[PDB]
Design a protein around this ligand. Structure first.
Ligand code: H42
Ligand code: H42
Lengths: 225, 225
């Protein structure tokens, strides 16, 4: 099938481990510290992954950073969603960090995680494929609506290249549903909505000052408010 | 062209006037009171308009209300956006209520209105047509991601019917761009993002208690938090 899709598939990063500190007592602070540390390491991986998206590295450094600073949480959330598709009412933040309802309550994350589970529910019913997941991650990055873009036409071109990939993939692989590509695009509003909820929640956690956060995660959280 | 599109066009409501009270001194409270009163009357019109969308009235009353309670602010914002396309850096909330940057500052709405102007900017560059605007309003209603839907399959059918209308419209009217339908769908995340910003802002205004609000607007604001 479509080459961009195959390319994004082979560029997909390996999963990483959350490694919650086994010497630390379980608490909301430990859960939030674990999650923010995991996100920080995933953001390094995301920055490396984006260089494989056709045309991304040719943008200016400022436009590359603007796209990432707008889209980073959507990309993180799409990952948890995809890893959680074979599960029921649990979120696989990592293989060693699977959050059920009780854990979400303990972390203060019941509302955020229920919103993520709504994304999971919809993708389950659509039978989201890995091919579609990796293409949607790239589309979310290109379509992230940053206010600070320099070369608007080159970013529009990146959106078009990735949108064409999804269109071509669905036309070849899913002839039974001539509207599947659009159905996939129509899941992007709920992704944006959930990401905004997550950014606001963790920005408040940042302000409260009780959860330590690393440099990159803080810089992404700060580029967004 | 497509019959659903033509139908939504002829079902389009007439514009209404804001009628800011000429006896009241200009202030943030007057501006916010004027806007909330205008939105309340538009919501009555929106409820009547939705009955013309194929299949909407056959949903249950609860599903009809759930869709409207999720989508109402996106529909309101799409209207201001469309009315503002021929303007520059001003928002035509109504023919008699056009907000420039100074007025937005006075109302406490500079950030919200700048976000709406970002939607306007994108639709300007795409040369958004009235046909596309009315179809996107209906798609936003059907795709509003309510957590409380009873007949999920009938709502998915409504989404598909409206999505097919946009696809068919663009395939017939815009052969020069085989990805225009998807481009239109890809504007929906920023619409959802801006609507969430507006709902949160006016919910805070509701809590502060200094701006009087009418029953329907309050009930839509309360169904969302
Ligand atoms: O893959 C990850 C890792 C951490 C976090 C998310 C996704 C999203 C919610 C914020 C925490
Ligand atoms: O057509 C309208 C009328 C009033 C309002 C909006 C749209 C949206 C922002 C909240 C106020």
């Amino acid at each position: 099938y479509n080459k961009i899709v195959s390319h994004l598939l082979v560029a997909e990063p390996e999963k990483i481990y959350a490694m919650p500190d086994p010497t630390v007592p379980d608490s909301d602070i430990k859960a939030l510290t674990t999650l923010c540390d995991l996100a920080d390491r995933e953001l390094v991986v995301i920055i490396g992954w984006a260089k494989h998206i056709p045309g991304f590295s040719t943008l200016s450094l400022a436009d590359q950073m603007s796209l990432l600073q707008s889209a980073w949480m959507e990309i993180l959330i799409l990952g948890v969603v995809y890893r959680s598709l074979s599960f029921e009412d649990e979120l696989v933040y990592a293989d060693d960090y699977i959050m059920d309802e009780d854990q979400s309550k303990l972390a203060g994350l019941l509302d955020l995680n229920n919103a993520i589970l709504q994304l999971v529910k919809k993708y389950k019913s659509m039978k989201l494929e890995k091919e579609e997941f990796v293409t949607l991650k790239a589309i979310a990055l290109a379509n992230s609506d940053s206010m600070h873009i320099e070369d608007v036409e080159a970013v529009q071109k990146l959106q078009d290249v990735l949108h064409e990939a999804l269109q071509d993939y669905e036309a070849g692989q899913h002839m039974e549903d001539p509207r599947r590509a659009g159905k996939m695009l129509m899941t992007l509003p709920l992704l944006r909505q959930t990401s905004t909820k997550a950014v606001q929640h963790f920005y408040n956690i940042k302000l409260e000052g009780k959860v330590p956060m690393h440099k990159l995660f803080l810089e992404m959280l700060e580029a967004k408010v």
